[PDB]
Design an enzyme around this catalytic site. Structure first.
Site, PDB file in Angstrom:
ATOM      1  CE  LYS A  48      -3.851  -2.538   2.035  1.00  0.00           C
ATOM      2  NZ  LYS A  48      -4.677  -2.818   3.245  1.00  0.00           N
ATOM      3  CB  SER A 105      -4.931  -2.161   7.782  1.00  0.00           C
ATOM      4  OG  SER A 105      -3.745  -1.880   8.523  1.00  0.00           O
ATOM      5  CE  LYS A 209      -0.305  -0.750   5.459  1.00  0.00           C
ATOM      6  NZ  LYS A 209      -1.313  -0.938   6.521  1.00  0.00           N
TER       7      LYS A 209
HETATM    8  K   LIG Z   1       2.211   3.437  10.318  1.00  0.00           K
END
Ligand SMILES: [K+]
Ligand SMILES: [K+]
Length: 263
Positions: A48, A105, A209
């Protein structure tokens, strides 16, 4: 430092699975330490950051507007879409979708953004064009998280992902406004809780991430450093373990604790 490789190896012993690791100097691009640097691992949600990097690149090129509103329906919702499931009628802007995808998410958010850039094929083309000839996205959420053993679909290598993240956060690929927007999204604190953040000393900066998929797949990509300024990129992936999420998390954290200790 090799003491950190001791921990990466311990993690493999504890998890009964492969662990890929790389520590890169943010400034110079020099690989400081690595373990299985060129072996493939599923990217899972770490993709992402690359996705929104491609979105920002389009914004830079005037082909996208962060404020553009996107409407969707129940037909578009896929598993785990905490933010998108509540804006079915309000719609969401491109900026809000990247925030939801990276910081919360949100899977549907990632699919909506993938559609805006041309899909997996265009994300992969974007990656290749910037020098990453390894990383590939083939599917959409949720199938890209399958983590089928020996399958190269939707994978990266610790080295490719680390080098690609460095390029996104440094140099000229993105404008400064976009670079910082990407970093800001990665800095928000919502998901990566028990991973590297838990090992970070006070005053340190971290933009990260993390992701989890099927078949024990787990990964985290990060830019971190002391004094609120990043100076290194760390990428950790593992797949195939039958250990609990908590056990996998603890191992990643122990690797982080070591990286910090021998900084
Ligand atoms: K983060
Ligand atoms: K649809």
């Amino acid at each position: 430092h090799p003491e950190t490789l001791v921990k990466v190896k311990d993690a493999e012993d504890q998890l009964g699975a492969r662990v890929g690791y790389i520590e890169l100097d943010l400034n110079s691009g020099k690989i400081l330490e690595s373990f299985r640097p060129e072996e493939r691992f599923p990217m899972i949600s770490t993709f992402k950051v690359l996705l929104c990097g491609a979105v920002l690149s389009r914004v830079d090129a005037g082909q996208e507007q962060l404020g553009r509103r996107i409407h969707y329906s129940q037909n578009d919702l896929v598993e785990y879409s905490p933010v998108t499931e509540k804006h079915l009628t309000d719609g969401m802007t491109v900026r809000e979708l990247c925030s939801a995808a990276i910081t919360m998410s949100d899977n549907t958010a990632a699919n909506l953004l993938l559609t805006t850039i041309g899909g997996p094929k265009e994300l992969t083309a974007f990656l290749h064009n910037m020098g990453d000839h390894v990383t590939r996205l083939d599917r959409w959420e949720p199938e890209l998280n399958e983590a089928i053993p020996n399958d190269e679909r939707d994978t990266t290598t610790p080295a490719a992902m680390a080098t690609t993240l460095r390029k996104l956060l440094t140099g000229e690929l993105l404008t400064l406004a976009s670079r910082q927007q990407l970093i800001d999204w990665m800095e928000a604190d919502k998901v990566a809780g028990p991973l590297l953040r838990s090992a970070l000393p006070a005053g340190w900066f971290i933009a990260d991430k993390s992701g989890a998929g099927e078949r024990g797949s787990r990964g985290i990509i990060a830019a971190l450093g002391p004094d609120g300024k990043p100076s290194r990129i760390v990428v950790i992936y593992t797949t195939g373990s039958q250990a609990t999420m908590d056990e996998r998390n603890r191992q990643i954290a122990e690797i982080g604790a070591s990286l910090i200790k021998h900084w």
